[PDB]
Every structure is written in C-alpha cells, then in structure tokens.
C-alpha cells in the first residue's frame, strides 16, 4: 500500500485533524487553556498549565493557517494569555500553573518555557500584530535564564525569583528547545537558532545516545555527565523515569531530520550524522519498544539492556513514531518506513482513537486496554499534518507558506 | 495569514456549503419553497413566497453544478413551481405569495420578479429541458412591466392586473435586476443585459451614491429624484427603512466588479469608475457600519451623517461584505481585503453560525446576542462559493463551466 | 498514436509556429505588408494588398498574445496601415491594393474587407489603444456596404466610390465574413454577429451545399440563385474557378464548429445541423479531393461529379483540412479525425515544408513536385495554433485568454 | 545540483532529441536505413544492415509517439523494409545485410533478429496497421530459431538456410533479446517474455558476472561454459573482443531494473537480486572503466583484473552509463547516481557532441581526441528519453501511453 | 495583453536564455573568462578581468541549475580561476586584471570583489565541492577590506598591497554589495548579510536618493558627503560620469524588492519604504530617462534637473528596467508595470538583439543605431530569468530550488 503523498490518505488525515481541532476548542479558559478530560470537558482542579497553553497557541496557529474560522481567535486568546496572569511580570517568564484564583505553581520550568518559545514562533506565522512582540520577549527570557551561555545547552528549571537554577540537566527540556529553535529559525532566518539546535543534538544524541545503542540518556548532572541510574530505586515512577523512553528517541530523530532539511534548504550539505542518528534512533525504538512483551504497541520505558520497564502504551510515543517514519521515508525513500507508518496507523485506529467520546485515548494497558484525561492534541499534528508537508521549513511556517499537499497526487 | 485561493480553506467553505444545502432541503412544499424556522422546520403560516422560491431555484442550480445528487430534483421542483400556482396565468408574472388555499398576496413586485429572472438564468446552466423556456418567459414579463423603456431603469411594483405601477423607485429592486442581468448575460451573450446592468449602476451608484460619501440613497420619486428623508419620522421601521443600508452598499460593490470582470473577459477595458466605486462603497461600509457602537458587527442602517440608526446585526450584510472583500481582493490584490474577510469569518463562526439548530442565525441585537426564522441560504453562497471562483462569468455559470477552485492551490 | 492534446506534439507545433512568425516579419513595408517570395524576400511588384495586410495584423495579434516580442509592434504597424495609405479618405473602406506611389487597385473587395474586420477584431485582443477604434470604424463600413440588410448575406464588391455593387454573390466572401464575425462576436458579445454567422452558413451550407452532395456551390447571381456552370468554359481559370474547391468545404466545416462551441460556451444547445454538416463537408472533402488521381494530396477543384479539375496541390486546402480534423475530433472524439490529421501532417512535412528557403511551399503539381511565391502564413495558424486551444472562444481571444495548451497533458 | 525530473533539464533533452531525430532522417534508402557517416551522409558501401534498419524502426516509433511529423512515415518505411528485401522469402528470418544489387550478408544473426523483435514491438505502439502482423511473424522466427527451448537461453546465429547454428553463445545477443523481450511483453502481456528475460539475466548476470567481480563474461561455448580467454591472442582485434566491455555491464544493469519495475507494475515484489546486481554492475563499470588511464572517459575493453585493454572511448558505453545512472536513481533515490549522470553529461557535451557536423562522434582515442561514421542514434534515446519516463512500461510503450515528463516539475 | 506568468512567454525567454548561455561559452581562457567581441570572439588584448570572471561564474551557476550540460564545467573553471592567477597569493583578494603573462592591473576594486562574493555565493547553489570554500574565503576578504565596520557601508578600492583605501565612496560598489549580500544571505541565513543590505540601501536610497527626486547620487567623499558636482566639468566622461545613472536607479529598486521578499519569506513585515522607494526610483527612471530626446530608449546619464547628459543608449540600463518592472508587478499587481515591460521588450528586439552576430549589442547612439564589444551576459539574466521566478530567494538559489515557472500557467 502507498499512503504517503496520496491525496486520498491526506484527505483522511485532514478530516481527522479537524475532529482534533474541534476537541481542543473547549479548553478555552480566562487565563489560557484548560486541561480536558476523557469527554472533552474541562477539569477545573488541573488549572492553567503553561505547557498546555503554549501548546494550544501552537496548535491553533497551524489551524489558522489551514483556513479554519475561529482558529485565529484562539491564537489571539493564547497570545493574550501569554501576556496575562501566566506571565510573572515581576521576575519574568511564566508561572508553571495558575487558575482564576491565582498562581498554582510558581516555578519556572525550562521545557515549559521552550514550549512558550514554540507557541510564540508558530503564532508569528499567522501575522497576528502581537505575535512578533511575544516571540521577542520570549527570546529575551530564554537567552537570559534557559540557554546557558557557558554550557551552550539548556538549563532545567528555576525558583520563581530566578535565584537558583536546579542542579540537573534533562534531555526533554533540551529536545523541546531544539523543537522551538527550528521554528524560531524559520521566522527569523537567524542561523544562531539552528546552530544551537544542532549543538544540543550533537551533545545529547550524537555523543551519548549514539554510544548507547541509540538509547537516549535523559538524566545528567551539572557537568553534563550522564546519570544512568537516576531513579533506579523507583523505576516505576513516571516523573524523570528510570532509563530511556523510546518515545523521545524517535522524536529526537524527526527533529534532526528537520535540521537536516533546513541546511539543504539553504544549499548547505548537512553533516551525515543527522540522518545516521535519526536512522539509529528509529531502529533502537523498533528494536526495544515495539511489541516486545507479547502484544503490539510501543512501551513507555526500557532499561539499559533494552528490556521494558514501564509497559503501559502511552499515546504520544506511537504518534511521534509515525511522524518520524514519515520523516525518514521523505529523506530516504526507503519504503520500509511507510510500512511501519501504516502498521502503526492500524494500531492507532484499533486501540487509541476514540470516536465515541472524542479525540484519542491517553494511556493503555500492556494488553492495550484503556486504563482508569486527554489534555493534549499537540502531538497529533505530528502524525496528522507533518506527513502532508515538507521537512523544511517547520510545520506552522510550512502550512502558512501554503505547502500543504505540495508533494501529493 | 493566507486563506484565499488555498485548497485547505476552500475545502472548509465547501463543507460548510453542504451543511447549508442540507438545511434548505426542507423548504420544499407543493407550491414551491417554504419559509424555514430556527430549527429548519417549515413555518407554514408564512406560505410560499415568490422571492424565496426564486432564490432556492438559484441555490440548487449551483448545488447541481457541484455534483450533489438531489439538487437537480429541487431545481426541477423549482421550475415546475414557477410554472404552477405561483404564476398568474391571467395577467402574467408571479404572485408575491401563495399557499394551499390560494393566493396570499397578489401584488407584482419588481425585486421578486428579478429574483425570478436570476433563478431562471441559473436554472439554465443545469441544462434542465424547461429552464430556457422559463427564462424566455421571465424576460417577456420583465421587458414588459419591470424594465422601463423611457426610464431605462427598473420599476418597483404593480397591482395584480398590471393596471397601475407604484409611484416609487427603489435601489434594491434595481440592484437585483443588476444581479439577475449579469447571469442572463452569461447565458445569452447578448450585451443588452450587461448594458442595462452597468446603466442602472451608473445612475444609482456612479451618479448618486458616489457624491454622497458612497452612502447609497435607496428611495427615489418617479422622476428618479432622491428622497433622502423617506421614512425619516420612523427610522426604526424595517420596510423601506430611513437612511442607508451598508449591507446593500457592499452588495453593489461586488456586482459592479462582476460587470468589470465581464468587460475584461471579452477584451474590453472596463470603465475605471466600476472599481473606484466598488472601493468607495466597501470603504464607506467599514467606515460607518463596522463596530461603530462599542461592539463588533455590521449595523443595519445609518443616517446621512453615517450615524447608526438600526443597530441590530442582520446576518446577510456581513455575509455580503465577505463576498465583496473577496471580489476587491481578486481585482486589486490588496491583502487588506483578505484581512477584513478573515476578521469577518472570525466574527461569523463566533456569533452567527448555528451548528446546533442548523444553518446560521438571522439577526442579533447590538451586543451580538441572538434575538427571536432562517428562511434564506441564498446570501450564504456569496461568502461560501464566490470566493472559490473567478468574478466572470457569474456564479452558476462559473461553477457549471467547472471553474470551482480554478485559482486555488 | 496520440498527438492531440499532448504537450510533446504541441511543443513541436509552437516551435514551427515561431519559424512561421519569423518568416513573415520580413513583409513589413511602409504602407503595410508586402508579398513575400519563395525565399521570404519582398516582391515589390505585387505592392501592398489589403487582404495580405489585414491577415498579418491578425497573425501577429496571435503571436503577440503568445508573448513574442516584436509581434505587438507589427500589430501596431498593421493598425497604422489600416489608417494610412490603404484607407480611402474620400469614400471610406480600403483600396484593394496600393504602393509607395499610389492606388494600384481602387476597387472595394468584399472578402478583403472581412479580412479587415477579422484583423481589427484580433488586434483588439492585444489591447492596443487604437484597435477598438479601428474595429468600430470597420463595423460601420461593413454594415454600410458589405452586410446586406435586405439579403441577410454578404455582398461581393463595389467600385471605388461605392456607387455600384457587383451583380454577383460568392461563397468565399461570405465564409470569411463568418470567420470575422465569430471573433467580432467574441470581443463585443453583440448577439447579432453570431446570428449573422449562423444565417450565412445556413444558406450556403445547410441549404445549398447539403443538397449538393456537400460540395459547396461557390457562385451565385444577385438573387442567390446558384450558377453551377460559372466559368465552365475555362475550367482551368482559377479566379472564380469552375466547380467546387474542397479546401473551402473543409474550412466551412471548422467555422460551423466554432459557432457550435460559441453556443455551448453560453449554455445553449446548438442546432444539430452544425455538427451534421461539418461532418458532411469533411467526408465530401476526403471523398472527392484526397488522393483521387494516383498520388497523395488534396486537389484544388472538382466538378459536380466529384471528378478533379484543377489537380495542383495548393497549400492552404490541406492545412485547413488538418484544422477541421482537429475541430471534428474535439467535438466528436472520433479518433479517425486524428488519424487524418496525422495522415496530412506526414504529407506536409514531406512535400510542403521548406526548411531550406523558409516557410512552406505554396503549390505543387499533381505529382506533388514543387513549382512556381509564399505571400501567406495566416492559413498556417489553423493547423499550428488551433489544435492547442478549445473551439470557443475564437483563436486570438482564446490565446489572449491564456487557454494555450489548456487541454494538453 | 538537481536535474532529474526537472522540466528545465528535460526540455534540454527533448531539444537535443529532436536534433538527433533529424540527423537520422537522411539514412533512408529503398531497402531500409543506410549507414550514415561523420557528416550525416549515407556511406553506400556499407549497404543496408538488419540491425540498423530495425533500430531506426524502433527509434522513429518513439519520435512518432512524441508527435513529430515524418516519424510515422519512417516507421512505415521500416515495416515495409522488414517485409521486403531484408526478408528471406525462402528460409524465413532476415539477411544480415542487403543493398540494391542483392544479399550482401545472408547469415542469420541472433542479436540482429532480436533488434528486429524490438523494432517490431516498438512499431506496435504507433498503432501502424501492419505492425502487429510483423511482430507475430518475428515471434515465430524467434521461438523457432533463436530462443532455445532446451537451453532456455538465446542462440547466436545460423547459416542462411537455418541448417547449422553456430557452436558459440554470447552475452550481447542474449542481452538484446532481454531488451526486446521487455517491450514484446509490454504489448502482449504474455508473461513468458518477462520470464525469459529474467531467466537470461539470472544466468549471464546472477550466476556468472556476479561471481566474476560483476564483470560480465561475454563468450561461452555450446554448453554455456565461459570462455574467458576467447580471442586473448587477438586483444584489440575487434568483433568479439577479449575480456569484458563495461558498456555492456552497465546496459545489463538498466535492463534488469526495467524487469524490476515491470514486476512492481503488476503488484508483484521483485527478486532482491535484480537491484543488487544492477548496483554491482554499475560499481564495477566506474571502478574499472571510468577515468582509469590518466584521462576521463569509459574505456571500451578491460581484462579480468579490471585493467584496461582497448582504451579508446566509444560513444555508446558512456551514453548507456547515463541511462543506467537514471535507472538506479529512480529506484534507489541515491543522489550519487545523479552526480554521475551529471559528470557524464559534462564529459559528453565536451568531447562527444558534434554540433558542427551533426549528432555525436562515434569513437575517441585514449586522449579523448576525435578519430575516424555515425551509423547509430538508437543508443542516444537511452540518455535523452529514458530519463523523462518511468521504468515501466518500456520506452516506446511509455511515450505512447503519454508518460513523458509525468514525474517532472 | 499579458505575458508575465504565461508559459508561452517564459518558453520564449528560456530559448533566448540558451542563446545567451551559448554566446558566453567562448569567453573561456586559461586564467578565467575573457572579453567577448561583437562576434563572440575573444578580444585577447582586454585580458582577463575579475568582474567578468566573477559574473560568468555566477551566470553558469544559474545555467547549471537549469540542467544545461557544460555549465557546471564552466562553474568549475570559474572557481579554479578564483583560486588561480586572479588571486593575489601575497596580499590576498583578487587583482582587477591579469593575462597569461602576469598581472595587468594589481589594484583591488570594491565592486569587483563584491561580484566575486556574488559569483562565489551563486556557485554554492550548484553544490560544487569547492564552492563553499571560495565563499568563506571571499567573506573574509570582504569583512576585512571592503565592508567598513566603522562606516557600516562599503569601501571603494585599495592599492595592490591593501595599505591605503581610496578617499572616495560610490553607489555602484555598495549596490553590487547589496546584490551579493542577498545571495550570500540565501545560502547561509546569517541575518547580518540582509541587515547590511538594508543598511546600505537606507543610506544611499532612503536618505539620499529619496530626498533628491529619487535620482541616485553616485559620488561621495570619505565621510559619505554627497559630491553632486563630481566630474561636472566633463559630464560626458564615462568613468564616474557626472549626474545620475537611471539604469542604476532602477536596479536599486529591484534589489530593494528582493529584500522585501526575503523579509516576507520569513514571516516578517518589511519596512514600508522598501516598496515606496522602489516605486519612486522606477517613476524617476521613466520620468527622466525614457524617450526624452526625440527617440525611444533609456539614456545613460541625466543631470540634477532630470535633463539628459550622456544620451547614448547602453544595453544594461533598459535590461534592468524590464527586470524591475517585473519585480514591481509581482509585488504590486499593477498591470502598468507589465505594459512597460512589454514596451521595453519591443524596443530590445528591434534595436538591441543581434541574431546576426550573436547576443545583444552593447551600445547605440541617440538614434538607436549601433556604435563602437559584447563582454557581458550577466545583466541579461535579469530580464530573461528573473521574471520566471519569485523574488525570494535570490535567482541562483530560486532556480536551484526548482522554482522556475512556479507561478506560470
């Protein structure tokens, strides 16, 4: 079967993309974007998280570019939210969480700020009068507290008043910085942002993952020395879980291809290691996490031997795997990648998609049974929109440039 | 943010267009098309109006051209209805309104007869075997009692037996004559109809509106002298309301652009005043009618000072403003026209579109809150289909010639 | 074997079209366009014919629309000539022939005035600021001296002062009137021009030719009674040759299809006889004129039993046949017409095309051997340009409309 | 640098193709196609060769499908030639060579009969009424004398009377049989022709060449035992030269991909070795024959250690190399193949193309200097037309199915 | 009459482009590219100029991206030249002129070094392995001797040893710097190059020309004080001619739009003055230099009152006018820019194109008659290639990105 670049498949994707945009509409709250439950209803107690608000701003910037009435207004709501109670106008940056009664979590977290940077860069492709203003501010905050000058890497987090940064370095914060850097690069054509992106990846993927059977090490100390046994005493705990999470490996793979595509787009040969490492990460993910325990699906975490630790099938990992499959196919033409893409779509519609209550299920059993909400729709664009556009420039910029389906027939 | 000429946006417009065709299918009644309420149910006390019946015939001629099974049948039903109880087999033309018991209103109104002309001209593009026959007849009636020889303008109304014509001349009847003449021109290529169209436009818009800050004067006496104070002592009355109706100003602009496009299509440099006046009318509309009273939306009427009189936001004015925004953009390429188009679509999906009960709401108060049917869908094609085809030839002809999305990517 | 609607074949045609445009550029003389000899050199002795000048005006309006620089400058030269020496400043119309000295032939030829009409209408598609004026002026004298209001047919010729019209009616003058009318109709949309075309064809073809085995009777008396034995005394004499000339039969066919397309372009069902008779004329042409004397080629004239009279293979007859073959194919879809088109192209490049001295040969003996200049290129566009555009609107209008290769893949 | 699938490069190719089609038009003689010299003149002493006549039949079948007037005529001339003098009315098959005086060479050569098969199969795509007949007749002769049912391979040659077949087997005869089998299969869909191509390829390439460092072994004995030292005492002594000729290795590669594409075209996964070996043959060609003696170019002959024997640069070897580079690129997506294609195109216009005297030079010395006709143009289509069409169906079938430039933008 | 974005017109441009590419192929010499004469022969006495070699390297990078074999070989020759004789191995940079015996002119001219930067940057789009190397090296020399860090403008020239810069500042050097910066920026995305372009243009155009009736002031002293009376004593002297040079005015306009396009390509709204000033420079060009002395054409120099000084008609000024006309049309949509483009194309084919001896004439007298070689083809790509691609990225980059005819139908 041939799906990639076929107008028939892409139309199915767009139709699913609309069902997804619709689901996100209800997250709208005075202070930003709320946390949606299993039936698309707001879960008041969760409040307004910075990362969710940043992601929604990003998601609706893409919907606005696709010509959907109402999306721009959500982009506008997101920009107002990023200029409201979420912003710490005394110390700078944004609180991790707030609600209609005040600040819930005042910490300043890197990954959530890089998501703010992404939302800002994507919002800019809509042409919204305040977008460029939000991005400029975000860049200042990022270059002041999250992009280490001496380390040339991303910091993890700080206390509310930016008095002390956490003595830890993580891969997820750096990966999403890579992600946001790509779009910032697209809306400024200032190579500094792409340089940082490749720098971060060379350190975490090219120097460490590559020497670890492509199993990405997530935890590091202040000197950026790996801490492989981090949380080994409690491997089941999900926060900064022990070992590697295949979901991130495969994400890192697509992002490097985006970097790969950007260099070529400006007639600059990409270092061969971008594609080599993307291939290895995809391979590592399939090797250790795909249907390794007697059932299909991608497990959540694996140890340093490649053996599954957290066997739950969280939604985003397989969603990202499809995005990467598409990315590798686009670069290599190797049809094996499309086979995986399709194999995973089969899985997704059979166990994840929820037409009854809306959107997709968030987490499943090791037997793929729904487990005892659905606060994200951001990852879904990576398997719904990404396979419809080129790897360069980034998604929002690509859809805004009108590159949707340009390679399909 | 680009929407115009993008297949992604146009796919959205078509999906909305189908939801609209669906909504109107219930209007079907023995004698023609009924009056649909807020839930899409027929309000039988309203009976069968000539204007509504004529409009539906027009709408479904476009639906048939778009390849929707069933549309042709409604077209067939319309043609037969225009040949039945609605037609005055004794004096000629059509009764303004009828029902099962008989004639509800026997007056012969110009604007409604011109819609009859539009409906017939649009039916002709479906190829229906009785369409040409219906057009020829409508033309006889029009050239006999509604297009004045000595005036070279259109009459307003006559009593049932055509013994006495009303001693009044209105812009609305003449505006729809222009609208109708354009399509008649497209299906006969007899310049006479385009000559008449530009003629009434030079009189009502180029000569009077143009020197009245582009605020169109609607009421005139038998000598075509404007009656600016018509209904001044009752500014609120809807029928022949005092002052100007921005919704009509904006309509006249698009129609004049259709004329402009018609002249270019046949290698004839269009008189520059067509574009100039279209710009002025559009500008006058945003100037006085858009968000003038502390809230968004296009007010209904304004005085000769540009001050709002009737502040309710009726659905069709902003709908037409969008069609015109498309027309001006298409001719001038000025992106500002697109921004207005988007501003208005954002407003429409937020306060006008009714996904719950169907179609769009009909009227909102000055605060954009619904007030209390939905008897029309004809205006909606001007913001759903028009943005997908060139300005020449007319809508039905263009869709029938297969020009849908001809310029999109 | 497929050629029609194939980009590859069409590219070949365009490339040959350019070779043809080039050749004609050398005919430029102060008073208009000269008579090119067998090597593209001007034959001063021939002077400046009205028909040659008007044809070139038409030819370069097409080249101009094709984006070839210099073409518009020739169009300009043509409009100045039509306003200079060739134009009778005392009686109106144009002298049949002139030169740097004075008027060589002062008679007012009907067919040359219709070529004047065609030339002006084609010039109008270029947008030249003086073309619309020349057309308007040409229409006046045409409706004044060549389009008989009482006959509803075209006259043959007048003396210089327009005091006496010839007591003769010919098919050639009327056919070119139809050719010119189509285009005039395309740039004005005055129904009458098409009605007139329809009327002329219905008399000369549907009434006479049809009842004459589809062999067109060329000569008539003032009351349109056919003179079948006109010049029977000198069958060889070419000026108003005896019998019928297949070349004209096939042209008529294509012109009726252009009328056919015109009618459908405005959503009108064309009377059946147009296609019927087109097919009849094409069948007769191949039946009596193709390879009827031991060698390939289309003979010049035939007697009323279909037997060849003047056997020389002149250039324009087979050129036209190819054009009509395309027209019939476009309407019927019958692949046999394409086989003929291909059969005739092979004959042409083998016997008519002259890459050596330029352009195409003008005439060959019954053995297809060259004999004795090359004063025309107008006909060549009917096998070179026509096959790349739809039948409606006319050639010049259709190319200026951007329809070149619209149906080719 | 991107060339493949770009309309700009393909336009250059077509324009160069036409120059080649033109050069070959002069080879026409009463008995078929003659031998053209360094200036496109016929070298009558060479007579009418079977292989030359068949190739031209094949070539102009492609030109005819490309819409070039005159091509079909040559195709017709070719078919009549295959039914004329060249055909042995007594014993069947075709003489190796004839001229106006009689049979110059009455031997029945295999490779020449396979070119006959090819020429007929390509002719079939033009739809010439006599083409199918010639193909069936050619098939009978092939299955009766050249396709060994017991050997499941192709014979080399027979005496005029088909009494004794040469006790020798060669790679070239079998390669061209594979070439012709591809097209015969495309116009018959008789599975056996493709099964035979695969069979032949699996022996000569997968069984032999593969175990010989991918250097094709050309000479075999009656039982197919390789004769590596065949004519080793007669090195440069042309006609069955000693060692391997890279040009052929590279042709085998392309033909195997054609087989590969054919299998996929009917939803059948092709044997892995087809592609693997094609890559192997390409590698060996560049490894041994490309720029191996101090200058650029592909040497004609090499020994079993990869050392150049005959160092002259013949034209076709590098031309085929370009065709295979494209083939390998279309299948693998590896840009390295396009780079080679480009470096070879650079070599060609610099040393082989002869715009001065026409077409391309035939052979150059080891310093790339012209030596001393131009009897062929058939090979050229492999670097001029092949890069514009997919690998399946074959060339002629593909151009006739209208696939020219289908994958280019 | 429309030509812009029509495949037919663009095919005519490409075909003429090839004629120009061919003419320059003979300028090849050992040390680079030579001076071509009125017959395309090398004027060996002129030697090998840096600017010429730099331009050619740039021109063939474009031809190479267009799929023309041979082009890449010239790009390679160009790069080896920039690394050979022309390069001053002792002091760095490149001599203004050399020949096979040695250095003819050891001076280091600014505008020529900026052409070096251009050629190098365009060379990078081919992917030539040594192109990036050349660009980097060129950037070093530019940032060290020609881009004043202190002035934020470009220097004019230095002595062979880079020990003293000329106490003069000029517009031409800084303009070609802007031209080169656009492309360097396209193949690096180092914001500074576009910022420098903006900077340079804001000084020379927005501050000076804008306040000088949009007449560009060429000459400045060391502190950038305008020297409007420079060479006023000998107005006819060609070197640093007195007054303004319209040709340059119009080039500046186009370059500013390339900047406009770049800014938008990265979702950034460009300063309004870029387009405002482009319109201004274009208007002034037409106002003062087009047909101001009794004959059509663009004069070479004009004084501070707009009166013509040097009336000779040089080739490049009008060539750039056509290029800018296209640019303004692409951004404004104003059809009047297309009329000028067409008006200028008619002039060109009539008086400048030389089909007889090749390429175009270099200069004409005030009556448009040829005077007295043809050492350039670089300017011609601006009226032949530019109108076939968007304004961003630059020409070499855009063609290599495969955007040729992207907007044409």
UniProtKB/Swiss-Prot annotation, chains A, B, C, D, E:
One of its GO terms (molecular function) is sulfoquinovose isomerase activity. It comes from the Bacteria. 6-sulfo-beta-D-quinovose binds at residues 55, 111, 172, 176, 238, 251, 362, 375, 379. It catalyses: 6-sulfo-beta-D-quinovose = 6-deoxy-6-sulfo-D-fructose; 6-sulfo-beta-D-quinovose = 6-sulfo-D-rhamnose. Changing residue 176 to A: Loss of activity. Its EC number is 5.3.1.31. Induction: Induced during growth with sulfoquinovose. Keywords: Carbohydrate metabolism, Isomerase. Belongs to the N-acylglucosamine 2-epimerase family. Homohexamer. This is Sulfoquinovose isomerase.
